[PDB]
Amino acid sequence: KALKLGAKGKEVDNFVDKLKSEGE
Amino acid sequence: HPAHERVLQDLVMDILRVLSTPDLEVRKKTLQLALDLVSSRNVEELVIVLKKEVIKTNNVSEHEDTDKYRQLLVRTLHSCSVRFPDMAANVIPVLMEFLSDSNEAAAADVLEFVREAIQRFDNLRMLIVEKMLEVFHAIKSVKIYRGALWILGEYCSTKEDIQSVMTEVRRSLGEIPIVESEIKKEAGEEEDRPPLRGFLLDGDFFVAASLATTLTKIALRYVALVQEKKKQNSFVAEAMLLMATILHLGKSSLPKKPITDDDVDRISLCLKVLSECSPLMNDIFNKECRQSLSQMLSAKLEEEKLSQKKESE
């Protein structure tokens, strides 16, 4: 029940979500 | 690509980190790319970084290409100041300190910039004249000295500035009459020769022809500014005395090379103009010379636009 910080792959997901926000 | 240019404009400060490379060609390409990406948004930060790099080149004497890099930085700051005139006031004082540099090529590029800036930007004339008077005594190159004399002669507009130019010219000539002073010195009645007296004794009388033109311009302007005839006549006679003492030196055996007949004709012309003080000569020296500079600068700008337009057409 410890607070988990950092999920692996979040940087790639953030990049993909930015690209989607730019219309890709 | 015009669509990508705006994205690269945001990265100009990161591109400037490449200036940490000591190679001159890498620095040259980086400065050219940064200059091409300059916008109203990044010009201020760019100019601050380029000023810091210019100051670093004074402290780092060790690299062979430091002088060439300094010249590239000066040209880059020139082009920024022409595109963004609001930056010129901040750039000019720092660039004018390089007129005293041993590197004649960097000092020449600064002098050409200062000549263009003082003609285009009326608000900078006072600042440029004041700074030029401060650095004038430190100028080592004859070519740079001649160009500084011309700027002071063309743009000094106040009575105080005209008197300051005459005082610095006298200081740079030393004791007058020059021939009598040098004979007394040889009779005992690099010897730190005032720079102008050094140049004349080395036989470089083309500086004296430019000085005669400068003295003619300032004397004619002083006559228009001062109402007291006795002060007008004293200042004109003082300017004529400086020309006459240089002609006497140039015809003497004292200089390493005698004065040329062309320089004698030019100084003699200036003496004759000051003796007659005709309104035609005053308009030629004080209006037409400045109009000719303005026409030359506009013509250069039209040819650059026409060349760019022929490439775009």
């Binding site: 219309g23 890709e24 | 775009s312 057409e313």
Partner: protein, 51 residues
């Protein structure tokens, strides 16, 4: 040199109808570079292949 005179029969580009993400299909630069390196690239401009 890029300003080709627009002809009456040239396509009208409606920017409002083009999807924002249409990258212009650049030619395959790897295959062009390989052909150029082998010397098999006919120079486009000067040797009219029908000369």
């Amino acid at each position: 040199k890029r300003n080709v005179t627009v002809q009456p029969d040239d396509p009208i580009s409606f920017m409002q109808l083009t999807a924002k993400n249409e990258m212009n299909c650049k030619e395959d630069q790897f295959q062009l570079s390989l052909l150029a390196a082998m010397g098999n690239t006919q120079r486009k401009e000067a040797a009219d292949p029908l000369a």
